[PDB]
Amino acid sequence: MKVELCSFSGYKIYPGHGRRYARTDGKVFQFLNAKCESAFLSKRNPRQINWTVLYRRKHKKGQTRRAVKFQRAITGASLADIMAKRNQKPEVRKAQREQAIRAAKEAKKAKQASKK
Amino acid sequence: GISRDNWHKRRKTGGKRKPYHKKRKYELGRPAANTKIGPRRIHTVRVRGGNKKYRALRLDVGNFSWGSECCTRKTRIIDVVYNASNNELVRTKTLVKNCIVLIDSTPYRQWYESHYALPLGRKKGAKLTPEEEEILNKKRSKKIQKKYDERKKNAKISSLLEEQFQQGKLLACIASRPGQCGRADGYVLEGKELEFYLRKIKARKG
Amino acid sequence: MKLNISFPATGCQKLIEVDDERKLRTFYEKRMATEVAADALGEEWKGYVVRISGGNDKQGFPMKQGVLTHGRVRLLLSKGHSCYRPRRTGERKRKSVRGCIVDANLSVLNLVIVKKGEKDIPGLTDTTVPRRLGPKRASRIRKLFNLSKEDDVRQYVVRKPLNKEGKKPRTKAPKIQR
RNA sequence: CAUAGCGACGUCGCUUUUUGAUCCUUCGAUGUCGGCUCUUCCUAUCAUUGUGAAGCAGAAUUCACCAAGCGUUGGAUUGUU
RNA sequence: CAUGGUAAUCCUGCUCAGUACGAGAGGAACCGCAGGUUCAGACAUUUGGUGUAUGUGCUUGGCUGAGGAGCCAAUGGGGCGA
RNA sequence: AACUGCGAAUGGCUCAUUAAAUCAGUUAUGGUUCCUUUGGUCGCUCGCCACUUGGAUAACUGUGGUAAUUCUAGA
RNA sequence: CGAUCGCACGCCCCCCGUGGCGGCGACGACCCAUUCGAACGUCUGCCCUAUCAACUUUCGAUGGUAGUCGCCGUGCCUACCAUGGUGACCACGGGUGACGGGGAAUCAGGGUUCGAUUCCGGAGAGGGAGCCUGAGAAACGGCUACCACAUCCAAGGAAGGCAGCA
RNA sequence: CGUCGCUACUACCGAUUGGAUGGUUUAGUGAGGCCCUCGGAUCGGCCCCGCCGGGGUGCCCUGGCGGAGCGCUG
Ligand SMILES: [Mg+2]
Ligand SMILES: [Mg+2]
Ligand SMILES: [Mg+2]
Ligand SMILES: [Mg+2]
Ligand SMILES: [Mg+2]
Ligand SMILES: [Mg+2]
Ligand SMILES: [Mg+2]
Ligand SMILES: [Mg+2]
Ligand SMILES: [Mg+2]
Ligand SMILES: [Mg+2]
Ligand SMILES: [Mg+2]
Ligand SMILES: [Mg+2]
Ligand SMILES: [Mg+2]
Ligand SMILES: [Mg+2]
Ligand SMILES: [Mg+2]
Ligand SMILES: [Mg+2]
Ligand SMILES: [Mg+2]
Ligand SMILES: [Mg+2]
């Protein structure tokens, strides 16, 4: 029930089982039995050993579109403010278009009179 | 990295040259492109001056020119046949600046019936009637027929190119440098070069 | 085990301290950017789906996408991956980061709530803070107010009123571009 | 300050792990050194138990008593003891 | 149970304690605790060794027409092994 | 403040290495590249946005982790 | 084969009345030329040493042919061939208390020594090696690794380069 | 003038398969970078289409939830 260990093979090493190998370069390893340690000390890659966990995972043995937008208020323009300013579609936008056009029209005529 | 220096070589007299500096960048090298045959895969590398070199990793289509009739068409590379540099490049199917390669001959044949109005690459005919018939007859007027029949006199193809058209394949030599331009242009063999290379290919096998 | 819950549709992220292994075991052996229903950590969180967006370690090392491990490894981080901004152009540095699968040894777990459930979380799902400042491109405001064609675009700008003590009142409007 | 510890000149003993002296047994043969291994025995006790004495302050050391239960090692050189 | 045999031994560290004692330098002990040496009697959970289960892979030469399956080389060699 | 561009390949220090190597003079690149400056070239191509298109990210607001750094993450 | 940024502002109005025209720049560019260069080249020139006389060539040494690679010319590298290339006119090897030159000292003339040193060229950033960006770096007051020193640490990490001025 | 005897200093030979520090290398191991062949943790687009919607008139101009087409793709 101690802190568990996993081996060369990746198997759980229950307490009181196997051996622990510490190399001179500061690395520690633990093995479940002498087969795992004889594979490790032979410098065999456990990915090419059929019964090891790494081989099982590397060969995968055993085992949509989303887009959402939301509306938020802006400092200076609340939700009601923006939703009102985006809902002049029954011809009111064309009213603003024409009224700006005519205002710019007297501006244009005043410029045309004071230019020539 | 890979150095293209000249100070790591021995002197002419055989003496050992001591370097007076470490490896500079402008004398660098890069691993060989080793162009293969397959679907197009071209890599862009940055070179000195910020310019662009195109590495051809795999190529399959190449603009080859007939030359004798001045017909240049973009055809498909089939496979490498002979390579004067290394014998091992024909095994690995590598496109280099001088290896001669078999290509598909359909554009040249198409141009030949479209311009010369004589069958080519066929055995006995009557096999592709809806197109070969209309391009063979054409029901043309006196002037166009006067053009075609005076172009008939020089409608002579060397027996080797006739045989290769019957085989449907042309063996042609690359002229560009894939891995420097990223394309595999070249020209079609004919003349003394053609039988020279054919004798070489016959010598290497059978 | 700190929890940085953050629900983007309203903002108002808050830090949460929970200390029970049973309640937060539902997160273990899950990659980041994986959406897990956070109903385990109390009744108030029922009906909620949360997304793991990353976190930090005991030593403060952040978590990076794609590492696929539980532990700390060193990566030669170039420009624009994560967890690294170059002091000068083209600079790459070897930095230590945390793998994407989450385990016990984390300090804070940054989280994103994907979908809303049945009731409101006090201080999280209420008091909607607004995004500060609106769009600056012409088409980016035309879309936002459904403008068709050059309809009074000057007067659909998001004018920003500001008020301080010594400030004589004044509204702020941005230089629209394009 | 003879006798804590030593003891000159003399003198009385014990032991047979030294070397002798002798020639009683063995010359119709008792296999002759050392080492290895293994058991047991003696105490004239090196260490350990309990003690007495000191020129025994502590520490260490020394003399003596009951005492042989247990222990008394690993190596270089040498056939060696 | 008559009788015969018999077996445990020794050391270190901590605390006592920089204490008693001693001018100082130096420097114990009793109880207690933790472990060891030598010896003895066992035992195989684990670690190691063996390994002809001639158990299972690999492999040399050869033999069965080949594949498959095998076998011989006085235990063919070798890995792992109940 | 930050994004973007540019600069940081200059200057300064030292003389360990280096004996046809560095270097000096001469000659060539018709065997190469070249930021910037300056001068040419920029309707030479027939082929439901052009009255100007899309997306993200800074700076910024907020929540933090680490003991620490010119470290950074989530929103 | 420009979806760029400022400055003064003007002209046409028939078609009309909202469009169409325009001046000074700034940024930008594929390419060409120029400038700044840079790199490899050509010829000629260097101290001491034979108690250094024969070197080079399997692992390129000299050359040819075809390629690879490099910004390009080339054994720069590969493949296939030939057997070459340099030496008493000092090759090759070793030493240098050698960075090279312009120059300094001494001064009949000829020379002999000294040039780390402010100008030109080269190299290096503790030793090596390897790279990203960029036109230009094998850059180090840029990065990666190792080696040697060495900083902090809560021991999990993190951070180094004064042969720049002091 | 030389041997011998004494005292100094200087080198030399010398068993010790002597010792130390530099430099160049064979061989083995070999970090890291670069290139290629793979790899795909994630991030977007199309096919969305369970639908309310629809206008030139069950035939969508599409203004949102939403399944996911369980594919095409970058
Ligand atoms: Mg603008
Ligand atoms: Mg006296
Ligand atoms: Mg007698
Ligand atoms: Mg006898
Ligand atoms: Mg006898
Ligand atoms: Mg006695
Ligand atoms: Mg006994
Ligand atoms: Mg066999
Ligand atoms: Mg068989
Ligand atoms: Mg037989
Ligand atoms: Mg036999
Ligand atoms: Mg075994
Ligand atoms: Mg630039
Ligand atoms: Mg020197
Ligand atoms: Mg000088
Ligand atoms: Mg200089
Ligand atoms: Mg340098
Ligand atoms: Mg450097």
From Swiss-Prot, chain B:
<comment type="function">
    <text>Component of the small ribosomal subunit. The ribosome is a large ribonucleoprotein complex responsible for the synthesis of proteins in the cell. Part of the small subunit (SSU) processome, first precursor of the small eukaryotic ribosomal subunit. During the assembly of the SSU processome in the nucleolus, many ribosome biogenesis factors, an RNA chaperone and ribosomal proteins associate with the nascent pre-rRNA and work in concert to generate RNA folding, modifications, rearrangements and cleavage as well as targeted degradation of pre-ribosomal RNA by the RNA exosome.</text>
</comment>
<dbReference type="GO" id="GO:0022626">
    <property type="term" value="C:cytosolic ribosome"/>
</dbReference>
<dbReference type="GO" id="GO:0042274">
    <property type="term" value="P:ribosomal small subunit biogenesis"/>
</dbReference>
<dbReference type="GO" id="GO:0070062">
    <property type="term" value="C:extracellular exosome"/>
</dbReference>
<keyword id="KW-1017">Isopeptide bond</keyword>
<keyword id="KW-0007">Acetylation</keyword>
<protein>
    <recommendedName>
        <fullName>Small ribosomal subunit protein eS8</fullName>
    </recommendedName>
</protein>
<feature type="cross-link" description="Glycyl lysine isopeptide (Lys-Gly) (interchain with G-Cter in SUMO2)">
    <location>
        <position position="169"/>
    </location>
</feature>
<feature type="modified residue" description="Phosphothreonine">
    <location>
        <position position="129"/>
    </location>
</feature>
<dbReference type="Pfam" id="PF01201">
    <property type="entry name" value="Ribosomal_S8e"/>
</dbReference>
<feature type="lipid moiety-binding region" description="N-myristoyl glycine">
    <location>
        <position position="1"/>
    </location>
</feature>
<dbReference type="GO" id="GO:0003735">
    <property type="term" value="F:structural constituent of ribosome"/>
</dbReference>
<dbReference type="GO" id="GO:0005737">
    <property type="term" value="C:cytoplasm"/>
</dbReference>
<dbReference type="InterPro" id="IPR018283">
    <property type="entry name" value="Ribosomal_eS8_CS"/>
</dbReference>
<dbReference type="GO" id="GO:0005730">
    <property type="term" value="C:nucleolus"/>
</dbReference>
<keyword id="KW-0472">Membrane</keyword>
<comment type="similarity">
    <text>Belongs to the eukaryotic ribosomal protein eS8 family.</text>
</comment>
<dbReference type="GO" id="GO:0006412">
    <property type="term" value="P:translation"/>
</dbReference>
<dbReference type="GO" id="GO:0000462">
    <property type="term" value="P:maturation of SSU-rRNA from tricistronic rRNA transcript (SSU-rRNA, 5.8S rRNA, LSU-rRNA)"/>
</dbReference>
<feature type="modified residue" description="N6-acetyllysine">
    <location>
        <position position="127"/>
    </location>
</feature>
<keyword id="KW-0449">Lipoprotein</keyword>
<dbReference type="GO" id="GO:0003723">
    <property type="term" value="F:RNA binding"/>
</dbReference>
Swiss-Prot record, chain C:
<comment type="similarity">
    <text>Belongs to the eukaryotic ribosomal protein eS6 family.</text>
</comment>
<dbReference type="GO" id="GO:0098793">
    <property type="term" value="C:presynapse"/>
</dbReference>
<dbReference type="GO" id="GO:0044297">
    <property type="term" value="C:cell body"/>
</dbReference>
<keyword id="KW-0597">Phosphoprotein</keyword>
<keyword id="KW-0832">Ubl conjugation</keyword>
<keyword id="KW-0687">Ribonucleoprotein</keyword>
<dbReference type="GO" id="GO:0036464">
    <property type="term" value="C:cytoplasmic ribonucleoprotein granule"/>
</dbReference>
<feature type="modified residue" description="(3R)-3-hydroxyarginine">
    <location>
        <position position="137"/>
    </location>
</feature>
<dbReference type="GO" id="GO:0071361">
    <property type="term" value="P:cellular response to ethanol"/>
</dbReference>
<dbReference type="GO" id="GO:1990904">
    <property type="term" value="C:ribonucleoprotein complex"/>
</dbReference>
<dbReference type="GO" id="GO:0019901">
    <property type="term" value="F:protein kinase binding"/>
</dbReference>
<comment type="subunit">
    <text>Component of the small ribosomal subunit. Part of the small subunit (SSU) processome, composed of more than 70 proteins and the RNA chaperone small nucleolar RNA (snoRNA) U3.</text>
</comment>
<dbReference type="GO" id="GO:0022626">
    <property type="term" value="C:cytosolic ribosome"/>
</dbReference>
<dbReference type="GO" id="GO:0030425">
    <property type="term" value="C:dendrite"/>
</dbReference>
<dbReference type="GO" id="GO:0000028">
    <property type="term" value="P:ribosomal small subunit assembly"/>
</dbReference>
<keyword id="KW-1017">Isopeptide bond</keyword>
<dbReference type="GO" id="GO:1903347">
    <property type="term" value="P:negative regulation of bicellular tight junction assembly"/>
</dbReference>
<comment type="function">
    <text>Component of the 40S small ribosomal subunit. Plays an important role in controlling cell growth and proliferation through the selective translation of particular classes of mRNA. Part of the small subunit (SSU) processome, first precursor of the small eukaryotic ribosomal subunit.</text>
</comment>
<dbReference type="GO" id="GO:0003735">
    <property type="term" value="F:structural constituent of ribosome"/>
</dbReference>
<dbReference type="GO" id="GO:0005654">
    <property type="term" value="C:nucleoplasm"/>
</dbReference>
<keyword id="KW-0007">Acetylation</keyword>
<dbReference type="GO" id="GO:0022627">
    <property type="term" value="C:cytosolic small ribosomal subunit"/>
</dbReference>
